[PDB]
Amino acid sequence: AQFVYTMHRVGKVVPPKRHILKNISLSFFPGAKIGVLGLNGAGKSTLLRIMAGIDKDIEGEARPQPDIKIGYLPQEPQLNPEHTVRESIEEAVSEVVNALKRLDEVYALYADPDADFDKLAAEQGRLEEIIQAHDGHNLNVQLERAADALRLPDWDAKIANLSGGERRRVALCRLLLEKPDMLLLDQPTNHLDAESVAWLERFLHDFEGTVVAITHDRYFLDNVAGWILELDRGEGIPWEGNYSSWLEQKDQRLAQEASQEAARRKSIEKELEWVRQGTKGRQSKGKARLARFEELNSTEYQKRNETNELFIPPGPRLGDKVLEVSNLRKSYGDRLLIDSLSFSIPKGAIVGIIGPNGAGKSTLFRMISGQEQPDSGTITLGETVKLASVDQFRDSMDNSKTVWEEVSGGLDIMKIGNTEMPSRAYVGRFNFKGVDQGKRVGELSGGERGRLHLAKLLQVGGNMLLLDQPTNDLDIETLRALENALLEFPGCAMVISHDRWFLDRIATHILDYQDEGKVEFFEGNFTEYEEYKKRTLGADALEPKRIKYKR
Amino acid sequence: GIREKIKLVSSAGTGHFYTTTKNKRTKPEKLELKKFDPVVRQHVIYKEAK
Amino acid sequence: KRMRVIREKVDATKQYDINEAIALLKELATAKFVESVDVAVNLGIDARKSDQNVRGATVLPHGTGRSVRVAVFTQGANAEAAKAAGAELVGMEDLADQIKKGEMNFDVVIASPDAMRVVGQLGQVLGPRGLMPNPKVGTVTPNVAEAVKNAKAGQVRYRNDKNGIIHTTIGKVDFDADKLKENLEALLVALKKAKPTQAKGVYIKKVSISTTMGAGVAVD
RNA sequence: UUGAGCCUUGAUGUGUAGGAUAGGUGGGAGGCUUUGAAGUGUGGACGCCAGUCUGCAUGGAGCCGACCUUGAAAUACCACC
Numbered sequence: 091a092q093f094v095y096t097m098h099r100v101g102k103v104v105p106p107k108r109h110i111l112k113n114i115s116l117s118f119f120p121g122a123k124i125g126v127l128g129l130n131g132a133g134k135s136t137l138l139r140i141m142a143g144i145d146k147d148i149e150g151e152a153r154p155q156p157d158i159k160i161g162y163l164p165q166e167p168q169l170n171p172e173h174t175v176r177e178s179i180e181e182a183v184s185e186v187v188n189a190l191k192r193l194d195e196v197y198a199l200y201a202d203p204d205a206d207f208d209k210l211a212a213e214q215g216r217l218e219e220i221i222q223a224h225d226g227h228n229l230n231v232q233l234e235r236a237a238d239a240l241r242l243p244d245w246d247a248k249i250a251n252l253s254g255g256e257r258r259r260v261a262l263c264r265l266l267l268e269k270p271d272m273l274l275l276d277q278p279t280n281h282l283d284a285e286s287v288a289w290l291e292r293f294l295h296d297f298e299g300t301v302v303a304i305t306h307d308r309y310f311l312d313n314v315a316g317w318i319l320e321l322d323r324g325e326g327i328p329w330e331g332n333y334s335s336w337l338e339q340k341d342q343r344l345a346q347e348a349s350q351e352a353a354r355r356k357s358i359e360k361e362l363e364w365v366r367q368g369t370k371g372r373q374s375k376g377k378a379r380l381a382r383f384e385e386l387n388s389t390e391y392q393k394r395n396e397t398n399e400l401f402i403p404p405g406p407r408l409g410d411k412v413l414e415v416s417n418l419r420k421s422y423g424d425r426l427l428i429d430s431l432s433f434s435i436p437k438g439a440i441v442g443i444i445g446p447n448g449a450g451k452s453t454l455f456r457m458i459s460g461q462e463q464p465d466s467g468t469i470t471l472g473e474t475v476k477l478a479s480v481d482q483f484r485d486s487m488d489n490s491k492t493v494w495e496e497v498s499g500g501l502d503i504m505k506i507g508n509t510e511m512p513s514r515a516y517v518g519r520f521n522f523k524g525v526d527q528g529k530r531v532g533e534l535s536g537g538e539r540g541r542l543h544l545a546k547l548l549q550v551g552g553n554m555l556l557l558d559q560p561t562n563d564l565d566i567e568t569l570r571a572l573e574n575a576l577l578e579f580p581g582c583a584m585v586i587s588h589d590r591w592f593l594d595r596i597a598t599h600i601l602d603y604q605d606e607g608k609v610e611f612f613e614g615n616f617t618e619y620e621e622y623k624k625r626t627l628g629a630d631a632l633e634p635k636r637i638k639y640k641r
Numbered sequence: 642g643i644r645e646k647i648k649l650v651s652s653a654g655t656g657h658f659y660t661t662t663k664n665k666r667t668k669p670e671k672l673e674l675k676k677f678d679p680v681v682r683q684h685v686i687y688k689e690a691k
Numbered sequence: 692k693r694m695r696v697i698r699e700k701v702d703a704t705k706q707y708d709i710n711e712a713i714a715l716l717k718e719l720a721t722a723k724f725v726e727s728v729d730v731a732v733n734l735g736i737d738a739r740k741s742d743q744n745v746r747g748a749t750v751l752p753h754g755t756g757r758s759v760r761v762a763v764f765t766q767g768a769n770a771e772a773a774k775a776a777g778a779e780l781v782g783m784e785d786l787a788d789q790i791k792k793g794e795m796n797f798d799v800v801i802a803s804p805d806a807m808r809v810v811g812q813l814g815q816v817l818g819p820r821g822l823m824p825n826p827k828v829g830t831v832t833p834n835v836a837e838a839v840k841n842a843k844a845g846q847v848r849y850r851n852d853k854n855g856i857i858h859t860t861i862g863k864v865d866f867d868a869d870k871l872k873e874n875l876e877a878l879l880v881a882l883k884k885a886k887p888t889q890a891k892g893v894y895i896k897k898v899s900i901s902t903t904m905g906a907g908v909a910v911d
Numbered sequence: 912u913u914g915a916g917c918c919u920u921g922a923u924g925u926g927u928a929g930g931a932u933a934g935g936u937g938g939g940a941g942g943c944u945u946u947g948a949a950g951u952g953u954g955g956a957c958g959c960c961a962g963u964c965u966g967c968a969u970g971g972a973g974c975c976g977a978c979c980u981u982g983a984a985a986u987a988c989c990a991c992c
């Protein structure tokens with residue numbers, strides 16, 4: 091069984107001397123499915139950037155087999171805002187389109203005999219060969235089939251005027267149109283809804299080539315992965331099994347490491363007590379034991395686990411009238427997202443906003459924050475309400491600035507409502523508890539980017555929160571910390587998310603989008619929402635179709 | 642000791658490099674200077690490398 | 692029926708000589724058809740690669756045994772020459788409105804290297820169909836009689852399957868062993884000429900020859 | 912008893928439009944089945960749930976192409992696939 095990829099002694103060093111990856115020796119075999127786990131900063135995206143060939147700085151040797159295609163989807167897929175849907179899409183088939191245009195230019199040869207045959211007719215064969223390498227002529231059908239299978243927006247739509255989920259779908263389609271042999275995915279379900287994620291995971295299970303996927307979720311991982319690469323601090327640990335068994339193994343590993351560190355502390359204290367005694371005569375003391383103690387005094391890497399410190403500052407006191415919408419309606423062109431929506435938000439409530447992609451979830455936040463003007467108006471907030479909004483996109487932070495400068499603005503004392511707070515203490519409240527204040531925004535990882543985003547955008551101190559997909563790149567630990575912080579909140583919050591479990595653990599009012607632009611509002615949590623649906627239900631259970639890619 | 646060692650590799654196409662240090666934490670952007678290249682005997686751009 | 696007996700009759704688990712296989716090929720006389728052939732050859736080429744895709748045309752001593760109606764989309768004073776040189780469908784480039792509508796199929800697409808202003812279907816409706824050829828293939832050139840002669844002689848074009856397989860016709864079994872050997876040798880030498888810049892393994896992974904209803908025997 | 916590989920024999924390929932599950936070029940004409948059917952009753956398997964493949968039973972000669980308004984054509988073989 092010839093492998094597909096190999097890494098031997100692969101090591102990476104980041105600023106100062108930090109071995110994110112140390113001695114990672116691995117082989118990737120045909121038909122494999124690997125899920126890469128770890129905390130927010132472990133080095134998963136680093137390892138995939140190495141596997142994509144983008145990073146060659148590493149120590150060791152990492153290489154794929156020759157003439158195998160690696161399709162790399164990062165966790166920051168960039169697209170051309172000028173481009174429309176088709177203008178961004180065809181770049182994945184640009185060879186065929188460019189060659190076809192060249193054929194159109196060449197066809198004037200047989201009209202005008204200028205440099206007739208010995209100069210370009212021979213190259214016409216090379217052009218027809220590059221068409222033949224693909225289907226080429228039946229290309230519009232390929233594009234239509236891909237768009238149908240991935241539920242892409244119509245090609246006339248622009249890219250800036252696109253929802254985050256559909257943006258990720260465009261990136262997925264442009265990646266998979268290349269038709270590679272090894273997929274590298276960096277959180278491929280970042281902004282996807284339930285149907286999109288289910289289709290993607292079925293496709294991944296069907297994929298013939300190798301798949302290496304980074305995921306902070308567990309159910310999609312149980313679906314797709316064949317084995318897990320833990321990727322702890324420094325070292326990568328393979329594992330055969332499911333997420334819960336791997337979790338058990340991980341707790342056992344961390345408990346053993348904690349016990350060994352405690353024993354090390356014990357032995358070091360004992361030997362220090364020995365070192366701090368006198369010679370007692372003209373006898374040994376001994377340099378061998380001194381050397382043993384000096385080498386025993388070493389350094390161990392503590393886990394940079396976020397855990398429960400996510401600091402949501404308390405806003406101003408909130409009256410009973412918080413938010414009210416009456417007959418809200420919004421449409422774009424001919425497709426309408428919200429139609430005759432009315433609801434009131436009692437104080438203290440967490441509102442789980444759910445629905446498919448581009449259904450209007452983010453545009454609702456735009457109206458509430460006042461950046462968009464509804465057709466049917468009647469959005470209102472109580473006079474005590476102070477709004478703090480967290481966007482679906484992090485594209486507002488200066489990647490040059492450091493963490494502390496970007497969060498705090500450079501002022502040593504930070505004002506949060508009534509109380510002045512030390513900026514360094516406030517930043518450290520968001521797990522940047524060391525010299526992590528010095529890291530650059532661009533050099534931060536995706537999960538650290540989300541944490542810094544929350545830190546910068548919760549400082550306004552509003553007692554109404556408008557969080558749009560707040561747990562995008564976060565792992566389970568930061569997710570739990572955020573859930574606890576949201577629970578210990580005096581004000582009220584509206585959270586848009588696609589994590590059903592995270593939304594269920596905190597939501598008190600469900601705002602769910604449906605077809606034909608109806609936004610059903612339900613006061614209650616997800617358990618009683620499901621119970622209400624069961625009480626007044628409809629008889630069927632089959633959502634998907636799982637269309638195809640090939641042919 | 643946080644100033645790691647870097648070499649500025651000539652863009653003239655020859656293998657020639659000046660060598661220097663750089664704070665890889667506070668200055669992640671790659672260095673770029675117009676230095677003399679004795680191989681071609683012209684001031685050209687040198688870009689940071691490993 | 693006759694399959695359920697020729698399956699027992701065949702011994703296709705070996706690799707046969709090109710002339711030790713003609714006897715087994717002629718043994719299929721118990722089958723009822725016109726018994727044309729579908730000789731197929733492999734290649735050590737990657738059809739995912741552009742530079743390994745193989746295409747062209749050949750000339751063979753005998754032909755396919757079926758007339759291929761070739762077109763000539765370069766009308767004008769050369770229209771009479773095209774019609775009288777062997778143009779089974781005389782439709783000029785400016786005369787493609789009515790003859791093109793009337794004829795919904797043909798043998799060889801037009802090839803007019805001195806005049807090829809016609810594109811066709813505006814979306815590859817003819818080029819994608821394969822019939823629409825290009826001059827580099829050997830159809831469009833300054834000569835007009837070349838296309839007519841190729842249509843009369845049944846010059847066959849090579850097409851590259853998804854796995855690099857090339858399929859071709861020789862004709863019915865009424866051709867003799869020597870004629871078959873000559874045509875297969877011509878095909879093999881043409882493939883030798885048209886081997887791409889990459890030569891991996893053997894240029895003929897496997898070669899087999901078969902009838903339209905009978906078995907397919909390797910030629911080694 | 913197994914694990915892996917290889918050769919064969921099968922089985923399998925639901926986008927939209929289309930008569931209805933259409934893998935790819937074929938390359939050609941009609942063959943298939945009557946060496947007993949286009950079916951009804953029955954049993955398993957697949958099942959993108961439409962459905963086509965299947966072991967049977969008396970009855971055993973009619974199912975598709977060809978015709979085209981679909982990007983493509985009709986398990987109507989052996990193929991190297």
Ligand SMILES: Nc1ncnc2c1ncn2[C@@H]1O[C@H](COP(=O)(O)OP(=O)(O)OP(=O)(O)O)[C@@H](O)[C@H]1O
Binds near residue numbers: 165535
């Ligand atoms: N040039 C640099 N200097 C210092 N630290 C850096 C540099 N580049 C990256 N880092 C740090 O390396 C760590 C690993 O980041 P990386 O993107 O590999 O993590 P990750 O686990 O894959 O992230 P995520 O899952 O959130 O996408 C982060 O803490 C990041 O701040």
Ligand SMILES: Nc1ncnc2c1ncn2[C@@H]1O[C@H](COP(=O)(O)OP(=O)(O)OP(=O)(O)O)[C@@H](O)[C@H]1O
Binds near residue numbers: 253254427449450
């Ligand atoms: N200016 C605009 N013109 C036309 N269509 C627009 C415009 N702005 C947004 N849209 C479209 O309207 C819909 C509204 O989506 P929006 O960005 O409000 O979030 P959503 O789709 O509900 O959620 P998510 O961001 O989670 O995918 C999307 O389909 C989007 O592409």
Ligand SMILES: [Mg+2]
Binds near residue numbers: 646647648691
């Ligand atoms: Mg150096």
Ligand code: NA
Binds near residue numbers: 134136276304535536
């Ligand atoms: Na990452």
Ligand code: NA
Binds near residue numbers: 254
């Ligand atoms: Na949006």
